[PDB]
Amino acid sequence: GRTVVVLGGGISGLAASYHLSRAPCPPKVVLVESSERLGGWIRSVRGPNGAIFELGPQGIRPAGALGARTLLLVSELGLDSEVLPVRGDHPAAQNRFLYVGGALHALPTGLRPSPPFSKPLFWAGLRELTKPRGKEPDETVHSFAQRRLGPEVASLAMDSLCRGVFAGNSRELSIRSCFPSLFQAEQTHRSILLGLLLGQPDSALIRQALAERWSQWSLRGGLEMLPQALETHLTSRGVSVLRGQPVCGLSLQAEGRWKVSLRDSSLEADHVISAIPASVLSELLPAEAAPLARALSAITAVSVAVVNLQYQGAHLPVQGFGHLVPSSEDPGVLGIVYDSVAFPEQDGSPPGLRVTVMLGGSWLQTLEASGCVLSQELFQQRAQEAAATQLGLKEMPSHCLVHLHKNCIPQYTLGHWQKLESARQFLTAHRLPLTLAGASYEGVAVNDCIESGRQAAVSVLGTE
Numbered sequence: 172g173r174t175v176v177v178l179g180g181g182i183s184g185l186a187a188s189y190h191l192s193r194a195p196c197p198p199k200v201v202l203v204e205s206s207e208r209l210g211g212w213i214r215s216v217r218g219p220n221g222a223i224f225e226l227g228p229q230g231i232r233p234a235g236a237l238g239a240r241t242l243l244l245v246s247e248l249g250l251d252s253e254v255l256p257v258r259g260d261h262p263a264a265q266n267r268f269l270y271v272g273g274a275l276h277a278l279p280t281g282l283r284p285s286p287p288f289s290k291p292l293f294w295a296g297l298r299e300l301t302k303p304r305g306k307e308p309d310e311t312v313h314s315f316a317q318r319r320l321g322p323e324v325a326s327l328a329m330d331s332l333c334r335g336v337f338a339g340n341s342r343e344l345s346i347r348s349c350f351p352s353l354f355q356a357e358q359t360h361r362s363i364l365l366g367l368l369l370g371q372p373d374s375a376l377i378r379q380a381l382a383e384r385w386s387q388w389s390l391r392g393g394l395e396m397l398p399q400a401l402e403t404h405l406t407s408r409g410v411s412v413l414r415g416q417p418v419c420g421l422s423l424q425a426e427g428r429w430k431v432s433l434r435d436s437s438l439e440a441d442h443v444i445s446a447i448p449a450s451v452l453s454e455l456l457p458a459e460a461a462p463l464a465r466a467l468s469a470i471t472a473v474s475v476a477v478v479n480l481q482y483q484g485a486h487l488p489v490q491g492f493g494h495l496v497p498s499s500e501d502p503g504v505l506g507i508v509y510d511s512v513a514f515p516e517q518d519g520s521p522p523g524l525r526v527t528v529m530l531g532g533s534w535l536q537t538l539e540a541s542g543c544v545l546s547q548e549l550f551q552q553r554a555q556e557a558a559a560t561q562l563g564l565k566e567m568p569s570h571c572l573v574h575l576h577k578n579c580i581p582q583y584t585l586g587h588w589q590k591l592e593s594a595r596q597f598l599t600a601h602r603l604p605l606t607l608a609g610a611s612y613e614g615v616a617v618n619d620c621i622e623s624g625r626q627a628a629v630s631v632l633g634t635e
């Protein structure tokens with residue numbers, strides 16, 4: 172008669188519920204979602220022409236053990252036939268670009284100065300092994316990048332990269348929290364390079380991904396297919412999914428059970444897995460849990476406006492994954508993904524070139540703090556100018572989608588590890604039957620969030 176309530180029906184909540192429900196002697200699971208739909212930021216639109224437009228992740232990187240674990244999840248859900256891979260025999264898999272100095276420049280692979288870098292990067296990697304080692308417990312991605320790789324690398328590479336992964340500022344982000352490997356490598360070995368030159372699930376799908384060397388994958392009906400298959404598996408196992416039911420309050424009681432307070436009803440839980448945003452959870456917590464709520468409230472998230480653009484009979488200047496825009500080149504336009512290069516089967520019919528412009532940065536952030544009106548037009552125009560200037564697409568978009576995603580990518584700023592440590596210390600010291608999960612904590616990628624929900628599920632199962 173043990174009940175586990177999962178807050179939030181994003182990919183984290185979905186995965187947590189999925190792993191709970193699949194245990195041999197599973198508890199009653201209730202998944203509680205505030206909105207009308209499940210899947211969180213993972214969301215796909217089927218446009219009029221049958222094209223697919225992604226409102227969240229444009230596709231998934233099968234990188235490392237977590238990449239592999241996600242492909243396993245996909246196999247378990249029987250989504251094999253829907254999988255669209257980008258195989259190592261194409262440039263979408265082999266071409267990242269930076270827009271710097273009125274031009275696209277290919278980023279290096281391995282193998283001579285490469286514009287916009289004045290010297291060949293070999294010389295920077297060299298002085299990298301020689302670089303001492305940060306003695307501070309935490310350090311910003313910028314400070315870390317500069318110190319070990321040089322100002323150009325810091326300003327063109329890590330600036331852009333933080334924008335591509337976190338839609339965020341390398342001058343504010345923690346190297347320790349945002350790029351753990353880079354940080355451990357430097358900490359343990361005395362150089363990023365050495366620590367990496369010095370060091371997994373299995374299934375047919377994984378094996379293929381390795382064999383064909385996938386740089387990423389997606390689903391035919393769009394990524395939302397993943398959250399959708401998960402939900403479908405949940406209800407078919409009697410898991411109880413509540414949609415349209417914000418959680419309004421959390422409190423403990425006699426027998427250390429949780430009362431989960433909805434709008435106009437309540438649930439009793441022996442355990443709660445919180446897969447909602449840290450700052451939301453924060454506001455849900457009972458006055459006794461104030462120190463945990465403080466730690467949670469210190470975790471914030473940037474917004475990102477996603478603009479999907481389709482042109483009929485247009486073509487790109489180059490072929491690649493997409494291109495990133497450094498902040499010194501534009502504070503509002505983070506980068507553009509070349510959807511048709513990776514996933515031409517999603518171009519609809521008549522087929523038309525598709526790109527996705529990610530807007531955000533301090534442009535969007537200063538605007539949110541302004542009295543300015545954040546209209547569809549404002550975003551449409553920004554994305555179009557960028558498409559026109561950075562890709563030479565002076566044609567009018569034949570289709571356009573605009574979505575302003577409020578507070579959608581948690582930012583792991585300096586001290587973030589300590590907020591996590593405090594939360595965990597409090598949770599364990601007071602034996603709260605509460606488990607944190609999701610993008611707010613130990614990684615924002617979908618792969619990370621899935622894993623985060625699995626770990627949550629696993630640890631709650633270990634307390635019957």
Ligand SMILES: Cc1cc2nc3c(=O)[nH]c(=O)nc-3n(C[C@H](O)[C@H](O)[C@H](O)COP(=O)(O)OP(=O)(O)OC[C@H]3O[C@@H](n4cnc5c(N)ncnc54)[C@H](O)[C@@H]3O)c2cc1C
Binds near residue numbers: 178204209232580
């Ligand atoms: C545009 C953009 C592009 C991205 N691209 C990629 C990429 O390609 N690759 C990649 O790996 N990752 C990508 N991501 C990041 C990744 O998609 C997210 O970090 C991840 O999906 C977040 O999942 P989550 O479960 O942790 O949170 P969420 O998806 O935000 O889910 C949390 C859910 O909890 C719900 N909730 C809130 N309050 C309550 C309440 N009180 N009661 C019940 N429910 C509540 C919310 O409605 C929400 O649905 C991208 C993100 C953005 C937005």
Ligand SMILES: O=C(O)c1cc(Oc2ccc(C(F)(F)F)cc2Cl)ccc1[N+](=O)[O-]
Binds near residue numbers: 495
């Ligand atoms: O590598 C990337 O993540 C990359 C992302 C791009 O677009 C984004 C996708 C998602 C986000 C996100 F998730 F941070 F919002 C930002 C950007 Cl700029 C464009 C280009 C690239 N790239 O490597 O050439």
